[PDB]
Design a protein around this ligand. Sequence first.
Ligand code: GLC
Ligand code: GLC
Ligand code: GLC
Ligand code: GLC
Lengths: 487, 487
Amino acid sequence: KIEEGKLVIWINGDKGYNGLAEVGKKFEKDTGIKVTVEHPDKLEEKFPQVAATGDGPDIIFWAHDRFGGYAQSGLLAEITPDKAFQDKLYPFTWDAVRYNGKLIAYPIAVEALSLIYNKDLLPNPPKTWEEIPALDKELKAKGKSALMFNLQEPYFTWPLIAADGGYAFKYENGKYDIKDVGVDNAGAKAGLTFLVDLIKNKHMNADTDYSIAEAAFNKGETAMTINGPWAWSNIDTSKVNYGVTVLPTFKGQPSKPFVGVLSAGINAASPNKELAKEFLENYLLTDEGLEAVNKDKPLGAVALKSYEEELAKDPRIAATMENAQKGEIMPNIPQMSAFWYAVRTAVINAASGRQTVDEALAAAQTNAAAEFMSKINDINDLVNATFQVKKFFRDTKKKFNLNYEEIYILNHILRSESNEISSKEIAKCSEFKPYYLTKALQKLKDLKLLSKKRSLQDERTVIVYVTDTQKANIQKLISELEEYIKN
Amino acid sequence: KIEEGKLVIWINGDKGYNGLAEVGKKFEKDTGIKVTVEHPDKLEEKFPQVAATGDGPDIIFWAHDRFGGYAQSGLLAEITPDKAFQDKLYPFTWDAVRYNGKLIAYPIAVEALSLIYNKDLLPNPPKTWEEIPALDKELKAKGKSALMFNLQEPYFTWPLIAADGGYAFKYENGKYDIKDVGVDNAGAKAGLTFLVDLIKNKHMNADTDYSIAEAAFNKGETAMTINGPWAWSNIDTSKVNYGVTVLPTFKGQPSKPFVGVLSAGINAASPNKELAKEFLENYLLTDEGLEAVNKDKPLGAVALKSYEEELAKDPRIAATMENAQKGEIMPNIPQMSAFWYAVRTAVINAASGRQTVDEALAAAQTNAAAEFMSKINDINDLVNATFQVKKFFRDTKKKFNLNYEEIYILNHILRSESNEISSKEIAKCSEFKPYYLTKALQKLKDLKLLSKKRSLQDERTVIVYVTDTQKANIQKLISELEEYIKN
Ligand SMILES: OC[C@H]1O[C@H](O)[C@H](O)[C@@H](O)[C@@H]1O
Ligand SMILES: OC[C@H]1O[C@H](O)[C@H](O)[C@@H](O)[C@@H]1O
Ligand SMILES: OC[C@H]1O[C@H](O)[C@H](O)[C@@H](O)[C@@H]1O
Ligand SMILES: OC[C@H]1O[C@H](O)[C@H](O)[C@@H](O)[C@@H]1O
């Protein structure tokens, strides 16, 4: 029940929701339809839950990295702006909101973690991470602290782990090899071990967090923090003489902050799509609209060309956009949430002292690439799960005589970047039986949708190939038999 | 990973955590083991999440109403204080922390919403709710507001809905009929409709909240608020001439504030149980310990007899304890969280204006009497689930040849209040096959743990009976084969 006739927006708490609300009112003024902004807590996780139910906001705002998995689940409506309109925005921002050839959300503003310091407490910010353990005892001297940033969310500690070779999922020919996870490499271990030690040497504690670090900096207690545009508002009225700049380099390399494109996705459930499209296209993505929000909180380097040729003047923005370039754009693929988790754990677990970086990261690597996030804790959850499963198949037995192994495959395929997979992949993943695996690939082959599958080269591992129109029919079928459980 | 050798406590933010921390230090002094208190935000919901994972605090503090569902899930350790000790506390407080014959948490202090007003702005508090819409325009006159209390959490608006016949789950022969939900009755509709209108007539707005109302009162802007002992601290330094008293009566009946027993449950996962038990029994539940915290924030009518014979002197306490009596003790049963939800929704939805009390409550009644569970949304969740299941059995095939149907039963039994169940129960619940159901009961019977099962009276709906030592072995087995799915 999304309730027609109005817009409900979900935007994160550290952002211009009051500003966006202004946009929403100008809309109501002209349109006549009301818009109400809300900043649920943890809307990124809450969205897929309530949105799977067919409820939730009409529009959800968040970094483009979550939208891949949303669109995947079917939570997001496909946006179809004409070419003229797309021209008002930077080609690379649409790219971030493009998933499997479709545009899933509107890009709003580019975000990158900048380095912010207190010029009255250090008119000269260090340009490296190694020349800091020292700068801490010098400022720890006059009763202060060198650095203080959020150590709870891996979005902040990633730049350091990334800098020297840490990476999400290897990238190459336009695709991401979700199997190739770079978080347990030398470069990754390096930056983390450093962060770990910065703590061991009482320079900063494992429990620092956004709230803590933000005050600590705005109240002069710390010489510098690590944050983005949205945080400038507070520092502004906290009227401190601060500067935004390049993230210190590690082992010589710059910090590679994952970059996020704050985008607005329209709920697939929503019954107000034409309205949301009109709000975002005609109202929000206009100079007024964007500045309206920028006033409340900094959007950073907006995606809207026109207005960005104003924000660009600002050295803060140019600083953001500089850090941006040095970092990589966040993948929008579904396996991202799994990535963020693996990392969150690893960091917290090793900064605390429960694990040695090696451990934290070896587990982290495994977790980041695991195909499944196990949702079963109690045997009651087991029973719960078993009941659900058992029910599912029995209901689809007649029509769709698709057994588990089969369903598993079609799914593994649909959630795949590649149009060609090997019996090895599908075998390593899923404790399957060579007997059923093969019988299953066959079972689907015999069906005009599994597309060709054919003897490996090396042999003993048949390659599974799926067309483009093939992968289109596997989708239409899943969406079809997915009605038997989606409720 | 709970980390042995220390205590981590989770207590709600509006309470004596600094005071509790003092207790924790006296402990560390004598013991040598450290204790760190923390007030996560929304620990009541966050606990079951992180605690299901096998992580979380060693000790969790909260109103006894949540503990039923915690113990249910298996999150809570069973506390076994000797009789002599139990004598130091009021028999009724142990009753609140007793679930299915076991003691799940230590009772700490009784809590009830009192009525607090500003004597300098009204030395005479109204004694009814009807004689208030008026008292608002008289104080709204000299630039003030009559009432201002939290309208977001249904814990505050319940007293009014309860007063005239609103009730959670009907109670009678010592049991709660979770099917009999009294929130859509006449008495319920009445009090809500009143609250609704108090807003319509611009006496108070639908968005008031703890924060807002608390300042509004402490800053003299409002003549009275609705709150409990923990809020007296702020009003104290806010040095206002306030008084704590009886909640105005509605339609003639007193306000029935759900009463909560702040209890301390020990995490079932925790590896420090003997220590937590020692902390709570030997340190926290002593006169010093309790007053240490009472200083920080008022506990209200403590459960510890000795110290309560001091607090009882205070007219505030006697006011609390008076309101308490007029209200009912909150049920500790699992269906409580579902209750709190249904109500939260209904209230907010109808106070806002989105729904007419009728609607809000009819939905609320339905919701309060529902069950909830990870239902699987995506076929990817299906695959996810199937993989988990399939794996589980294969791992327990050798050691524990317990098939699904069997596991299902032992679980249904363990999560049962009764020590006797009928083939009907286990049959209606679980689309089971009469063939397997029976074969399964048999399979377990043949095992020395399913206890007796024997021909019904009525039909051949065989009655399943489990000892007391029987239900103890079914538990030890589940905990045993439950290691195969831990994460
Ligand atoms: O906590 C990390 C998050 O911080 C802010 O919300 C950023 O806008 C968002 O892109 C990022 O994902
Ligand atoms: O640090 C973890 C977080 O980083 C960024 O905020 C991502 O946008 C978000 O998805 C993730 O949870
Ligand atoms: O908001 C409701 C809560 O208020 C206070 O924290 C009470 O101590 C607690 O018993 C209750 O659950
Ligand atoms: O209003 C809802 C809340 O009411 C009381 O405070 C309960 O103790 C708490 O568990 C519940 O969530």
